[PDB]
Design a protein around this ligand. Structure first.
Ligand SMILES: OC[C@H]1O[C@H](O[C@H]2[C@H](O)[C@@H](O)[C@@H](O)O[C@@H]2CO)[C@H](O)[C@@H](O)[C@@H]1O
Length: 404
């Protein structure tokens, strides 16, 4: 019978890829359908480029793709419209914001699978050791805490110890981190939902200068090459007071044999001042049936399974990844394992989006401009003031003649 082939989630990031292959195999066994899994690269922008090769070829060789929240406007031609396959009641079981994000010109490109928001990981043991009672609320507090704890831990003999790790590599994850820096300084959304390119302002420049200030001081010099896993590995070995990362890192830090099990919490990222907005970049992944699949009915069935209550539950409990079903945030077993899901729900619902709606199919070009100009501040090549001016110009060229 058919072989249903799935591209999604990378075995190079946490346990995601192993778990996803497990779920696909479970569906195959349940339905008596042969299945195969195709591994993806760690970085989302690399995965996009890989999947674009299949799409350009109208290739039937992948039936189902795990797609990033920032992708629907790029990938819509390559997606089977799921709208006719779901009842209105079925669709309403997902967060409306994410169903809306995944709907492009009326086409439901993909079902919501898991959501994501950037958060602050912090070492509770180390805060207590050094006389702090709460995690930092302002970036200045984060810097002051990081300097004090680093001084102490280095004096105590840990030469691997840093104050703060984050994603500073030139790739999409830096766009995520930078949106949080800029938005939390009251510098705006880089490109506003209405199309205004707002980034050339002093608050956005300050945010970027601040982040440069961390490099080689409270964060490793090598942070300019860090993606999610490189940051996580410093953190997870016990060598960082603070980390910016996504929810998946929580379950990994709590696993048996983790050096930091039981020693951390999570909270909203800091902000410049009490009147700035909280910043948490909206992430997450969706499930797309390929427009080029020869087996749309079977592929839709698998996608519905993967996005189901019990599979999302298993993702939450085992991998601490955020459900796209509001009902799971009240499930006793989800909450018992991840109490912070309740505590930070408002952070997740107020997460700030990257400018993928407004940039539509040009988003990847816009983001490449953002991460390259930001990276030039991090590396010291440019000051924030010059970078936000140069970024304004670049985005203006990229989006000239584009309307949403
Ligand atoms: O790097 C930016 C990318 O980060 C997140 O995707 C991670 C995800 O949290 C992990 O659980 C796993 O699936 O790896 C993904 C990276 O391949 C965001 O969800 C995504 O929106 C964002 O672009």
């Amino acid at each position: 019978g058919p072989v249903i082939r799935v591209a999604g989630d990378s075995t190079a990031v946490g346990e995601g890829g192993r778990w996803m292959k497990e779920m696909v195999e479970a569906w195959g066994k349940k339905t008596g359908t042969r299945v195969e899994y195709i591994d993806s690269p760690a970085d989302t922008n690399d995965a996009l480029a890989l999947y674009q090769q299949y799409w350009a070829a109208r290739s039937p060789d992948v039936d189902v793709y795990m797609i990033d929240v920032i992708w629907p406007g790029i990938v819509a031609p390559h997606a089977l419209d799921l709208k006719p396959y779901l009842t209105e009641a079925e669709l309403k079981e997902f967060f409306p914001r994410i169903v809306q994000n995944n709907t492009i010109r009326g086409k439901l490109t993909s079902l919501p699978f898991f959501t994501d928001a950037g958060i602050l990981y912090y070492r509770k043991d180390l805060l207590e050791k050094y006389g702090y009672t709460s995690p930092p609320r302002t970036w200045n507090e984060l810097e002051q805490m990081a300097e004090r704890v680093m001084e102490g831990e280095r004096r105590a003999g840990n030469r691997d110890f840093w104050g703060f790790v984050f994603q500073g590599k030139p790739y999409e994850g830096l766009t995520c981190d930078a949106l949080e820096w800029i938005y939390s300084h009251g510098g705006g959304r880089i490109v506003e939902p209405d199309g205004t390119i707002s980034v050339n302002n002093g608050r956005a420049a300050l945010a970027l200068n601040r982040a440069h200030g961390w490099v080689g001081r409270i964060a490793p010099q090598g942070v300019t090459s860090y993606a999610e896993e490189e940051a996580r590995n410093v953190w997870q070995q016990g060598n960082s007071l603070f980390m910016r990362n996504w929810p998946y890192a929580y379950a990994l830090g709590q696993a048996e044999g983790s050096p930091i099990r039981g020693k951390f919490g999570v909270t909203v990222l800091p902000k410049a001042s009490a009147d700035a907005p909280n910043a948490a970049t909206l992430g997450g992944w969706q499930l797309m049936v390929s427009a080029y699949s020869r087996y749309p009915k079977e592929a839709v069935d698998l996608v519905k399974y993967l996005a189901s209550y019990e599979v999302q539950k298993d993702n939450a409990v085992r991998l601490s990844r955020l459900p796209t079903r509001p009902a799971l945030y009240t499930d006793r077993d989800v909450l018992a394992r991840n109490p912070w899901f309740r505590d930070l729900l408002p952070v997740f619902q107020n997460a700030v989006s990257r400018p993928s709606d407004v940039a539509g199919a040009r988003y990847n070009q816009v983001s490449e401009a953002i991460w390259t100009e930001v990276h030039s501040v991090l590396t010291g090549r440019k000051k924030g003031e010059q970078a936000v001016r140069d970024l304004e110009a670049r985005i203006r060229r990229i989006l000239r003649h584009h309307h949403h």
